[PDB]
Amino acid sequence: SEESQAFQRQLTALIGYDVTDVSNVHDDELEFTRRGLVTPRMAEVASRDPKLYAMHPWVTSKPLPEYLWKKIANNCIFIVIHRSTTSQTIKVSPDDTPGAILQSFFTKMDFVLRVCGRDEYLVGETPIKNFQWVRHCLKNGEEIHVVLDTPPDPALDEVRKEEVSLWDCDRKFRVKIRGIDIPVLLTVFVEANIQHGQQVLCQRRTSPKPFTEEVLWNVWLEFSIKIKDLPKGALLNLQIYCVQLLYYVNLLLIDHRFLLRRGEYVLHMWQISGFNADKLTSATNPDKENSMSISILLDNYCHPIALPRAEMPNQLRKQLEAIIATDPLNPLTAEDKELLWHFRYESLKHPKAYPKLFSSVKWGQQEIVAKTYQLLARREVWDQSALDVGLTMQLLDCNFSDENVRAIAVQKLESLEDDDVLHYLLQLVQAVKFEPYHDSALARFLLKRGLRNKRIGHFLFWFLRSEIAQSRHYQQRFAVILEAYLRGCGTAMLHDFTQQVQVIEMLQKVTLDIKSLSSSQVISQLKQKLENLQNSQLPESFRVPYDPGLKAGALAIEKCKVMASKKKPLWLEFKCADPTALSNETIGIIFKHGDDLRQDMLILQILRIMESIWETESLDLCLLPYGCISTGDKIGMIEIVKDATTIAKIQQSTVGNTGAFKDEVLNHWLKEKSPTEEKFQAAVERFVYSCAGYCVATFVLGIGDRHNDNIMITETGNLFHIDFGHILGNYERVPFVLTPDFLFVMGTSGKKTSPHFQKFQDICVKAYLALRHHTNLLIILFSMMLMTGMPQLTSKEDIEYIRDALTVGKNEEDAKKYFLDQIEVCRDKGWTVQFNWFLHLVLG
Numbered sequence: 001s002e003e004s005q006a007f008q009r010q011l012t013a014l015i016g017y018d019v020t021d022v023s024n025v026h027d028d029e030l031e032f033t034r035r036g037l038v039t040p041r042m043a044e045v046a047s048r049d050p051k052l053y054a055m056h057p058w059v060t061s062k063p064l065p066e067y068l069w070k071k072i073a074n075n076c077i078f079i080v081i082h083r084s085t086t087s088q089t090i091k092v093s094p095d096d097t098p099g100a101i102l103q104s105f106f107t108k109m110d111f112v113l114r115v116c117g118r119d120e121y122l123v124g125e126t127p128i129k130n131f132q133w134v135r136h137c138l139k140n141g142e143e144i145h146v147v148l149d150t151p152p153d154p155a156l157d158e159v160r161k162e163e164v165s166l167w168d169c170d171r172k173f174r175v176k177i178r179g180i181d182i183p184v185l186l187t188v189f190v191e192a193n194i195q196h197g198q199q200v201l202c203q204r205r206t207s208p209k210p211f212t213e214e215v216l217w218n219v220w221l222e223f224s225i226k227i228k229d230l231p232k233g234a235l236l237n238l239q240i241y242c243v244q245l246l247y248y249v250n251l252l253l254i255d256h257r258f259l260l261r262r263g264e265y266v267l268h269m270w271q272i273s274g275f276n277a278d279k280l281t282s283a284t285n286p287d288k289e290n291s292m293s294i295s296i297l298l299d300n301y302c303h304p305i306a307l308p309r310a311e312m313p314n315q316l317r318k319q320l321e322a323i324i325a326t327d328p329l330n331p332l333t334a335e336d337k338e339l340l341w342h343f344r345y346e347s348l349k350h351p352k353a354y355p356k357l358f359s360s361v362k363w364g365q366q367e368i369v370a371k372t373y374q375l376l377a378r379r380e381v382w383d384q385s386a387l388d389v390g391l392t393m394q395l396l397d398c399n400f401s402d403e404n405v406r407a408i409a410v411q412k413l414e415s416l417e418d419d420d421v422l423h424y425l426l427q428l429v430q431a432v433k434f435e436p437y438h439d440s441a442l443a444r445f446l447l448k449r450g451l452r453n454k455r456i457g458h459f460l461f462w463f464l465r466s467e468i469a470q471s472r473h474y475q476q477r478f479a480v481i482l483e484a485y486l487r488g489c490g491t492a493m494l495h496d497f498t499q500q501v502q503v504i505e506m507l508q509k510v511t512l513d514i515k516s517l518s519s520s521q522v523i524s525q526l527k528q529k530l531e532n533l534q535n536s537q538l539p540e541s542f543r544v545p546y547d548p549g550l551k552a553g554a555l556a557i558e559k560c561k562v563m564a565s566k567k568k569p570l571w572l573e574f575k576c577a578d579p580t581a582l583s584n585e586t587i588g589i590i591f592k593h594g595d596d597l598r599q600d601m602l603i604l605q606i607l608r609i610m611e612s613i614w615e616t617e618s619l620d621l622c623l624l625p626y627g628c629i630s631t632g633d634k635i636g637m638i639e640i641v642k643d644a645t646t647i648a649k650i651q652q653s654t655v656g657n658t659g660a661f662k663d664e665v666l667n668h669w670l671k672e673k674s675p676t677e678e679k680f681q682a683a684v685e686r687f688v689y690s691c692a693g694y695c696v697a698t699f700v701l702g703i704g705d706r707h708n709d710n711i712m713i714t715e716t717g718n719l720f721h722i723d724f725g726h727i728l729g730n731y732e733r734v735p736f737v738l739t740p741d742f743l744f745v746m747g748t749s750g751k752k753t754s755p756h757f758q759k760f761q762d763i764c765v766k767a768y769l770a771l772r773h774h775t776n777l778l779i780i781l782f783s784m785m786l787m788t789g790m791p792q793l794t795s796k797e798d799i800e801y802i803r804d805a806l807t808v809g810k811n812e813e814d815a816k817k818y819f820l821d822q823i824e825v826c827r828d829k830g831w832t833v834q835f836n837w838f839l840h841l842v843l844g
């Protein structure tokens with residue numbers, strides 16, 4: 001069909017990479033996964049209620065927090081229903097269904113309740129107190145404005161039609177290293193490794209030969225592992241040294257069909273620069289003219305080789321219990337491993353032991369793996385226990401190459417409601433990088449979830465698209481997942497994603513084109529190019545990628561400008577394209593090149609997770625984790641937090657480009673911007689909370705020592721950090737930033753105390769203690785973040801920072817003292833560090 005031979009060109013420009021291309025593949029695993037995904041996709045489309053899918057209610061089965069209950073007049077929430085112009089207020093109880101909120105308007109004085117100014121529907125059988133939009137209304141002191149209208153037509157979604165034994169040969173596995181060769185450049189040798197989940201099962205090498213643009217060996221490298229002991233997910237890892245590593249490449253020793261890898265191979269190798277997820281890829285370097293390659297041979301006879309509790313002492317029990325207790329990063333000695341293994345059935349009654357128990361497995365032994373599978377059939381406790389995301393994330397990291405282990409963690413995620421899937425989506429997507437195969441329970445889980453809900457589906461799209469555009473190591477695998485998702489979301493979203501891509505691609509060339517001049521001469525062209533695009537180029541509107549609910553209209557040209565950073569970002573403003581928009585505020589997006597916005601994404605995501613850990617304890621630490629979409633390499637968009645200034649600019653205003661930071665200023669600015677002393681005391685309350693929130697979160701993440709220009713505040717007291725790639729993204733110390741100008745708002749002056757400051761410490765202590773209950777979760781997310789998104793900064797010693805910060809092993813009281821001491825390094829230091837940042841960041 002020419003229709004579905006044009007559709008493929010659409011998907012291709014939507015993905016940013018061509019899936020059908022078969023030039024950089026040495027097998028049919030991708031075709032196999034593309035085909036492989038047809039069933040889970042079609043199963044999901046056929047399974048979704050077309051109406052609830054069309055309206056995508058943003059719901060939560062979580063209890064309504066205290067800070068929102070303690071902000072209720074009397075079991076009464078007010079909604080304002082709009083039509084023509086005619087407003088109308090109804091007396092509604094939190095437990096009121098939105099279906100019954102109409103039987104309180106069609107009788108109390110068919111259709112659907114849509115939020116004013118956004119594509120957000122209050123539909124289905126949920127208590128209204130459970131709609132995400134209702135909770136944010138209660139939080140920010142805002143009236144709930146609904147506009148009655150027609151439900152979208154489900155028919156708008158609708159998708160376009162479609163239609164011997166390895167355990168029987170005891171031979172030592174071997175690889176023939178024919179030789180290497182590099183288009184253009186010493187001593188050089190191949191190192192060959194048989195790996196499984198970062199566990200090296202064997203090591204062999206070749207003889208150091210002279211480094212010539214062509215180096216041959218024709219050697220057979222016999223390993224000490226039997227053909228019959230090779231576990232599925234095992235990688236032949238080939239590497240080149242000289243001693244320093246130069247290039248690597250991997251090859252699954254067992255394919256997607258369970259066949260021992262036989263034949264001839266020429267593999268284009270990945271270069272190094274300057275541990276991480278890129279070193280794990282089964283993908284080869286597409287760049288042929290430049291890459292080093294390697295030629296090998298694997299035995300190829302006949303011959304398809306296919307792959308098919310008692311008592312316990314006391315000091316041992318207590319030794320075992322101490323192992324299960326230890327954090328995810330604490331290492332296991334052979335003694336610990338042999339212990340976990342011997343008492344495996346007793347280790348099975350503790351879900352918390354699974355990562356350590358599965359890590360104590362000798363995967364290079366057929367019989368052992370076989371018994372581990374015996375163990376997996378006795379999974380009742382794991383299956384029954386309450387789902388633990390931190391524990392679940394652990395079995396999906398780089399340390400576990402076995403599909404059956406990985407799949408039990410995916411089985412545990414199936415019971416996550418949409419709300420929670422969004423909290424962990426970015427990291428589940430990054431977790432695909434640790435999958436030995438392109439087709440996994442996780443890749444299908446991501447797919448099943450995207451296809452069932454447009455919010456998860458929208459973000460799943462941008463997340464995959466971000467990776468396809470800047471990761472050559474994982475783009476193929478990611479392009480196959482995106483294509484699977486796009487062939488089932490519906491033509492509605494299909495067309496909708498098309499609008500989005502056109503706009504953002506248009507605005508990126510502009511970003512790059514304006515960047516080419518590093519002035520009044522600049523201010524000129526920017527307004528010229530935005531005049532061009534506004535005609536028959538960018539269509540009427542488009543969804544805001546970081547906020548799927550908002551549709552952005554035309555460019556309010558007058559407000560758009562190039563900003564003053566070494567990298568010249570664009571400050572763009574859009575009219576809301578929705579007439580029902582209660583207001584006339586624009587949509588502010590920053591477009592930039594030079595910031596590894598991938599890093600901000602991972603950080604902002606953990607920031608949303610800490611806001612959620614604080615909710616389990618009725619704490620609102622007022623963080624502003626702004627929308628942020630990475631669109632490629634060192635490029636993307638940033639949501640503009642309205643009514644906000646940089647702390648340094650508030651200083652540069654009444655001291656100006658100096659360092660003579662007056663402790664008086666911030667409080668002057670806050671009073672300057674407050675219309676009443678009522679609003680001033682809220683702007684002070686929001687400050688204490690916001691400051692405490694960032695102080696802890698920042699400290700825990702090891703991004704506490706920040707420059708003055710990289711901390712912002714709203715005219716309403718909300719402080720917040722920015723530019724998360726600018727630190728460990730390109731990196732005397734302060735633990736976090738708690739300067740004298742902040743402290744002066746709180747009431748204190750240098751070495752004193754005030755009510756707000758004690759409130760400050762009591763929030764900080766609570767907040768800091770509240771996260772320590774999720775030590776394991778945070779350690780794993782922090783760990784996964786460094787492997788998948790922090791190029792260079794791994795070491796493992798960078799990871800182990802979080803252990804120290806989270807003061808693991810320490811009891812509560814010892815942990816409260818440690819934090820208060822950290823608040824003291826701040827008190828002691830005052831302006832020392834900020835001053836060095838000016839001395840460093842503004843002058844050298």
Ligand SMILES: Cc1nc(N)c2cccc(C(=O)Nc3cc[nH]n3)c2n1
Pocket residue numbers: 590595600626638639640641642644722723724
């Ligand atoms: C999040 C936010 N909001 C602003 N109002 C803003 C205003 C000026 C500059 C930046 C900014 O540079 N943010 C970032 C974040 C990552 N890179 N740059 C801003 N970021």
